[PDB]
């Protein structure tokens, strides 16, 4: 009931299945590709030069300014905002350095309070922020 069940009816079932996959959004997103026209370019981590420092603020109800740097990428020569985690840390980054960017960890989309940006800075100058924030490595 509600489908072909008969012995010879395997063309109807196989071909109808191919149609119904295009309703599913995960098959649709993979196949369209559709991913290339992205700043990340489908790469988890990207690097390049800092343009400057920007204050972008949270939506609602959370009143807070977040401090995300603007970063030009190496490979595309695009520009994109990118969050800087931990308190301080904007002071540690320095102007016009190379940084390694990675994703917000939400497999796309925009994460917390913070709209727009989908990116966090993992390293600066080949060191890593956690080491820097903790202060068991140095910058000149």
């Amino acid at each position: 009931k509600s489908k072909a069940c008969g012995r010879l009816a395997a063309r109807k079932l196989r071909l109808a299945h191919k149609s119904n996959l295009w309703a599913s959004n995960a098959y649709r997103r993979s196949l369209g590709t559709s991913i290339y026209k992205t700043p990340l370019e489908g790469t988890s981590m990207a690097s390049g030069i800092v343009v400057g420092k920007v204050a972008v603020e949270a939506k609602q109800p959370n009143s807070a300014i977040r401090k995300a740097v603007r970063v030009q990428l190496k490979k595309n020569s695009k520009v994109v905002t990118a969050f800087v985690p931990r308190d301080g840390s904007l002071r540690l980054i320095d102007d016009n350095d190379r940084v390694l960017i990675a994703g917000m960890g939400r497999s796309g989309r925009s994460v917390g309070d913070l709209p727009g940006c989908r990116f966090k800075v993992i390293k600066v100058a080949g060191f890593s922020l956690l080491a820097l924030w903790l202060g068991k490595k140095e910058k000149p």
Binding site: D87, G88, S89
Partner: peptide, 10 residues
């Protein structure tokens, strides 16, 4: 923006 990482130093 003027004040950042204030809590941690203080």
């Amino acid at each position: 923006l003027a004040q950042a990482g204030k809590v941690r130093s203080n």
